[PDB]
Amino acid sequence: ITARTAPAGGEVRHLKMYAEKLADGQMGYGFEKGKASVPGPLIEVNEGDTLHIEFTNTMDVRASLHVHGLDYEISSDGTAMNKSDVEPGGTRTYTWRTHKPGRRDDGTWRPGSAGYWHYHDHVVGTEHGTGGIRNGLYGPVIVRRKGDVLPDATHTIVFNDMTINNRKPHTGPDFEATVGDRVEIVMITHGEYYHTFHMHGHRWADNRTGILTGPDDPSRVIDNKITGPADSFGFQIIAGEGVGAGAWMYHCHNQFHSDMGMVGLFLVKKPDGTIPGY
Amino acid sequence: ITARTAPAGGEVRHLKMYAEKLADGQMGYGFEKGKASVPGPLIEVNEGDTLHIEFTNTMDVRASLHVHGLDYEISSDGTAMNKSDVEPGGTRTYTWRTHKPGRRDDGTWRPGSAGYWHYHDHVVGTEHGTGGIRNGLYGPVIVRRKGDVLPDATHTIVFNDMTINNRKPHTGPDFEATVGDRVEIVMITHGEYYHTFHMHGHRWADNRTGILTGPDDPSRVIDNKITGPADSFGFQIIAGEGVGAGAWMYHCHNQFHSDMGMVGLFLVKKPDGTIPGY
Amino acid sequence: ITARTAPAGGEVRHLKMYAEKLADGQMGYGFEKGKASVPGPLIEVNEGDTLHIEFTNTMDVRASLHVHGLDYEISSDGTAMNKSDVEPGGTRTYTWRTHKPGRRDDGTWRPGSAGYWHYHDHVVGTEHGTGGIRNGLYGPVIVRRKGDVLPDATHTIVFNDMTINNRKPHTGPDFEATVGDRVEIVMITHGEYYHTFHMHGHRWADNRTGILTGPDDPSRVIDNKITGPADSFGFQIIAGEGVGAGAWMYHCHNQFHSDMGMVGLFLVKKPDGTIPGY
Ligand SMILES: [Cu+2]
Ligand SMILES: [Cu+2]
Ligand SMILES: [Cu+2]
Ligand SMILES: [Cu+2]
Ligand SMILES: [Cu+2]
Ligand SMILES: [Cu+2]
Ligand SMILES: [Cu+2]
Ligand SMILES: [Cu+2]
Ligand SMILES: [Cu+2]
Ligand SMILES: [Cu+2]
Ligand SMILES: [Cu+2]
Ligand SMILES: [Cu+2]
Ligand SMILES: [O-]
Ligand SMILES: [O-]
Ligand SMILES: [O-]
């Protein structure tokens, strides 16, 4: 494999994070005051790393940080039940851990933390975060196994109720690549609706990484993926492979949802910077 | 592997079962008169066993027994069409069979019966059992393969329309374990809604057993699983592994269903019997 | 394997296809004027084949051909955006390509095209084909890998909104087989609803082919599959294997949908041509 690959983990990492009310009524996470985004920033770590997140709630209401997939003690589960949220103006240090897979004392096989995960609020509006999630308090988390193939770029597409990344209908987002780039999609669903994520001109493997290990990998190959509230998956594709440059649609294939605006463009450019037909 | 494992099957087994109207209007199965439950009792067998169920309908309406996954002849399919239901006060012997996997005459591979299955009524209210299922006429079936790892306890969680196990909203059920136990969950969905099953602090393999065979198993690891009417899956987790004791929520992650009461607690205790915070 | 298997592909193939308004208001595809069907005709090819489709729109509105899974250039994506629909009475030649899996320059493994795919309209009624799809402009596409087991017959079941193959409620379709036949189902969902496809008496592997490769295939075995708009899977079963002849129901297991008509019969006959009870 002459492609870049993930190294072995085991670092202790530190991170400051804020929750911020945005001028338009939304709420968003950020690594710096004044730089919050919806989706929130991407967190990426290696199996076996530990992450300490000093989280500050700059909002006028209680807020929290709850994560999927990774190891965390009950003091870091981000629920009010377990006294794990943060009052207005407060600050709390959450700890997430990850581990490599391996053999248990009893001979069984313990799975590792690697995968396409996510984090979101758990106490704004209700004790399940219905208000925070709706306002934009969600973001992606990636845990890499040693040897995993690394991309040229990562993009995050979140189906939040009937919007993509909390955008107005029929406003994308759109992404650009050049034929040949190795592009990574992290795909997360939130809210109360069910969807199917479809991408013209490309396909991926329905397994942890989106890639086949080789001629023996039994994972099915798909271009349409059903998803419900709090599902998360990811894949990599070679932009334009076998199909060439173009304005390639991605959307929810639910005919009502795409009619209502859940559509965007994956713009794959020729080497001269152009898109066939434009 | 020094954990307990399932033995090879091939026994002929016998069982008495009743359907019973409950005093509150619900309907349930049981192995003894006066001891019906919702969910009905768990039936567990080994690939290759045969099960003869003498089923007695003690209700004032027709009722039946329909099973997923296992081999049954058309006389045991539990539909009114094939004249397989049971008149009020009547009795009928259903036969379910299971087989091991193996090579067919043509060289192809016949799959075995092992899996997490379920049984439910097919004629109460409509000819698809909409009334019986609504009332509580459903229960889990587990078929084990030789060598499967055996748990310390098994619990059944059924999303029935917008309830868990037909309970009133926000009334559990809750389960208890001690840090370290091998806990097995059978997860079944019924009715007319779609859900996603999420469990704080734990994860599992999205394959038949919920466990990885080893370093070569391509199965993805998840903590959130989409499910629709009559889907059934199962898994095992080590209670508290890598995360410790605590009151860990499980729920449907659909924000509307969560807010409406589809929540419960998986209470993992320290050895002294306590739960951090209580 | 002394069953029939797919050969290696690589042919260039040609096809004439029409879109046609039906006397009852529906629309459908066909290989011959006067012979359109809903679902449209099955297209089947071998990994590595190329397919040239001369498509003629005989209707009084724009129509197109969009396909899942296969390789196509942006000129053949069937969207109005990319100027690849067909005006009334017009003709256009779409090109679909497929490739075998294999090792990329960087050492990664490129997936092949094989699978259970489908084609449908993209511009009738809306720019996502909501009108064409609802009217009947959809059909199945099968791409075989060298070595794949071949069936005795293939049937196409499409859950389109709350109909099967656009039929009136409780009107099938029904299919007939004889105990022992190798039967292949192609299962496609369209519209705005979610379903679960269930088949009495039979089960299949939840992977690309529906079949297990042998003792090491980790794929789970199911008889109930959740599906949303534009999902497509397929499988093979041995009619009556281990369960015998009979009138076996298949349906959507959503209790509302089957009460409302989404039911058909898979009639498995004894060698004398009869069905237990009829
Ligand atoms: Cu939660
Ligand atoms: Cu959608
Ligand atoms: Cu498409
Ligand atoms: Cu969550
Ligand atoms: Cu049924
Ligand atoms: Cu739910
Ligand atoms: Cu969680
Ligand atoms: Cu059922
Ligand atoms: Cu499209
Ligand atoms: Cu349905
Ligand atoms: Cu059934
Ligand atoms: Cu499509
Ligand atoms: O599409
Ligand atoms: O959650
Ligand atoms: O059923």
DSSP of C194-247, one letter per residue?
A: -EEEEETT--EESSSSSSB-STT----EESEEEE-TT-EEEEEEETTTTT-SEE
Within chain A, what is the greatest distance between any pair of CA atoms? 62
- Find, in chain B, the residue whose alpha carbon is nearest to that of C263: B128
- Determine whether the shortest distance from the Cβ of C196 to ligand 15 is under 6 A: no
- Amino acid letter, C52: H
Name the burial class of residue A12, with classes exposed (0-12), middle (13-18) and buried (19+) by CB atoms within 10 angstroms of its CB. exposed
Which residue in the block uniquely carries the two structure tokens 């329309």?
B161
What gap in Å lies between CA A6 and CA B20, rounded to an integer? 59
Q: Are A108 and B148 in contact (CB under 8 A)?
A: no
* Measured CA angle at C93 (ends C91, C95), to 5 deg: 155
**Which neighbouring-strand residues pair with C225?**
C197
What gap in Å lies between CA C68 and CA C142, rounded to an integer? 11
Sequence length of chain C is 278
Cα C18 to its chain centre, rounded Å, is 18
CA distance to partner chain C, nearest, from residue B253 (Å): 17
User: How is residue B88 annotated by DSSP?
Assistant: T
- Determine whether the shortest distance from the Cβ of B257 to ligand 15 is under 6 A: no
What gap in Å lies between CA B158 and CA B165, rounded to an integer? 5
What gap in Å lies between CA B235 and CA B154, rounded to an integer? 10
For this PDB entry, the determination method is X-ray
Kindly state the tokens that stand for C67.
Answer: 């396909």
C-alpha distances in Å from residue B15, one per residue of B54, B96, B139, B250: 6, 11, 15, 33
A231 neighbourhood in chain B, CB within 8 Å:
196, 224, 226
Kindly state the tokens that stand for C206.
Answer: 């939840």
Q: Are C225 and C195 in contact (CB under 8 A)?
A: no
* B134 membership: H or E segment, kind and range: helix B130-135
CB atoms within 10 A of CB C88: 11
What gap in Å lies between CA A132 and CA B42, rounded to an integer? 40
Q: Are B156 and B234 in contact (CB under 8 A)?
A: no
φ/ψ of A221, rounded to 5, equals -105, 130
Q: Are C86 and C62 in contact (CB under 8 A)?
A: yes
Q: Are B70 and B78 in contact (CB under 8 A)?
A: no
C-alpha distances in Å from residue B131, one per residue of A12, A158, B121, B194, C255: 56, 38, 9, 18, 10
- Cβ within 8 Å, pair A253-C230: yes
Kindly state the tokens that stand for A42.
Answer: 């991407």
- Amino acid letter, C201: G
HSE, side-chain direction, 13 A CA sphere, residue C209: 19
Q: Name the percent of chain C in helix, strand, coil, to the closest 5.
A: 5, 40, 55
Q: Residues whose CB is under 5 A from ligand 2 (ion)?
A: A 195, 252, 254, 257
Taking the Cβ of residue B198 and every Cβ of chain C, the question of whether any pair is shorter than 8 Å is answered with no
Terminus-to-terminus CA distance in chain A, angstroms?
Answer: 36
Q: How far is the CA of A135 from the centre of ligand 13 (A)?
A: 29
- Amino acid letter, A66: H
User: How is residue A273 annotated by DSSP?
Assistant: S
Which residue in the block uniquely carries the two structure tokens 């899956």?
B233
What gap in Å lies between CA C251 and CA B121, rounded to an integer? 16
What gap in Å lies between CA B42 and CA B207, rounded to an integer? 21
Name the burial class of residue A213, with classes exposed (0-12), middle (13-18) and buried (19+) by CB atoms within 10 angstroms of its CB. middle
Q: Are A121 and A153 in contact (CB under 8 A)?
A: no
* B256 membership: H or E segment, kind and range: helix B255-260
Q: Are B44 and B28 in contact (CB under 8 A)?
A: no
Taking the Cβ of residue A99 and every Cβ of chain B, the question of whether any pair is shorter than 8 Å is answered with yes
- Find, in chain C, the residue whose alpha carbon is nearest to that of A203: C69
Closest Cα to residue A154, out of A171, A142, A137? A142
CB atoms within 10 A of CB C216: 11
Kindly state the tokens that stand for B246.
Answer: 């605590």
Kindly state the tokens that stand for B124.
Answer: 């109460």
CA distance to partner chain A, nearest, from residue B29 (Å): 32
Q: Are B90 and B114 in contact (CB under 8 A)?
A: no
Q: Considering CB atoms only, which of A1, A246, A256 is closest to C108?
A: A1
Kindly state the tokens that stand for C192.
Answer: 């705005």
Q: Are C231 and C257 in contact (CB under 8 A)?
A: no
> Could you tell me if residue B273 is left (phi over 0), alpha (psi between -120 and 50 degrees) or otherwise beta?
left
Q: Are B179 and B239 in contact (CB under 8 A)?
A: yes
**Which neighbouring-strand residues pair with A56?**
A18, A91
* B255 membership: H or E segment, kind and range: helix B255-260
User: How is residue B243 annotated by DSSP?
Assistant: T
C-alpha distances in Å from residue B182, one per residue of A101, A235, B153, B270: 18, 32, 7, 15
What gap in Å lies between CA A56 and CA A64, rounded to an integer? 9
Which residue in the block uniquely carries the two structure tokens 């954990």?
B3
What gap in Å lies between CA C4 and CA C153, rounded to an integer? 13
- Set out the domains of chain C in order of their start, with CATH numbers: 12-144 (2.60.40.420), 153-269 (2.60.40.420)
Q: What is the dihedral of CA C269, C272, C276, C277, to 10 degrees?
A: 120
H-assigned helices in A75-171:
130-135
Q: Are B145 and C212 in contact (CB under 8 A)?
A: no
Given strand A175-178, what is the order of strands in its sheet? A175-178, A263-269, A246-252, A195-199, A224-227
Q: Hey, CA dihedral for C8, C12, C16, C18, is it positive or negative? A: positive
What gap in Å lies between CA B97 and CA B277, rounded to an integer? 48
Q: Are A121 and A65 in contact (CB under 8 A)?
A: yes
* A57 membership: H or E segment, kind and range: strand A50-57
Q: Name the percent of chain A in helix, strand, coil, to the closest 5.
A: 5, 40, 55
- Cβ within 8 Å, pair C114-A221: yes
Sequence-distant (6+) residues with CB within 8 A of A216 are none
- Find, in chain B, the residue whose alpha carbon is nearest to that of C241: B71
- Determine whether the shortest distance from the Cβ of B258 to ligand 14 is under 6 A: no
- Cβ within 8 Å, pair C190-A255: yes
- Find, in chain A, the residue whose alpha carbon is nearest to that of C106: A2
H-assigned helices in chain C:
130-135, 255-259
- Determine whether the shortest distance from the Cβ of A249 to ligand 13 is under 6 A: no
Which residue in the block uniquely carries the two structure tokens 């069937």?
C78
Q: How many A/B residue pairs have CB atoms within 8 Å?
A: 123
**Which neighbouring-strand residues pair with C232?**
C188
Cα A215 to its chain centre, rounded Å, is 28
C-alpha distances in Å from residue C206, one per residue of B31, B174, C70, C223, C233: 33, 32, 21, 9, 9
Kindly list the partner chains of chain B, i.e. chains with 3 or more CB atom pairs below 8 Å.
A, C
φ/ψ of C133, rounded to 5, equals -60, -45
What gap in Å lies between CA A138 and CA A161, rounded to an integer? 13
φ/ψ of A75, rounded to 5, equals -65, -10
Name the burial class of residue C130, with classes exposed (0-12), middle (13-18) and buried (19+) by CB atoms within 10 angstroms of its CB. buried
- Amino acid letter, C58: T
Q: Are B200 and A71 in contact (CB under 8 A)?
A: no
Q: List residues in chain A that are followed by a break over 2.5 Å (C to N).
A: none
- Amino acid letter, A99: H
What gap in Å lies between CA B31 and CA B13, rounded to an integer? 14
Q: Are A144 and A48 in contact (CB under 8 A)?
A: no
Q: Hey, CA dihedral for A99, A103, A105, A108, is it positive or negative? A: positive
Cα C19 to its chain centre, rounded Å, is 18
HSE, side-chain direction, 13 A CA sphere, residue C261: 15
What gap in Å lies between CA A232 and CA C48, rounded to an integer? 33
Rg of the Cα atoms in chain B = 19
Q: Are B135 and B25 in contact (CB under 8 A)?
A: yes
Sequence-distant (6+) residues with CB within 8 A of C226 are A226, B194, B226, B227, B228, B231, C194, C195, C196
- Amino acid letter, C77: D
* A12 membership: H or E segment, kind and range: strand A12-21
C-alpha distances in Å from residue C27, one per residue of A258, B215, C167: 22, 51, 13
What gap in Å lies between CA C267 and CA C251, rounded to an integer? 14
Q: Are A263 and A165 in contact (CB under 8 A)?
A: no
φ/ψ of B123, rounded to 5, equals -140, 0
Sequence-distant (6+) residues with CB within 8 A of A23 are none
C-alpha distances in Å from residue B44, one per residue of B5, B51, C200, C222: 14, 10, 20, 17
Kindly state the tokens that stand for A237.
Answer: 């594709």
A257 neighbourhood in chain C, CB within 8 Å:
192
Closest Cα to residue C232, out of A251, A226, A193, A234? A226
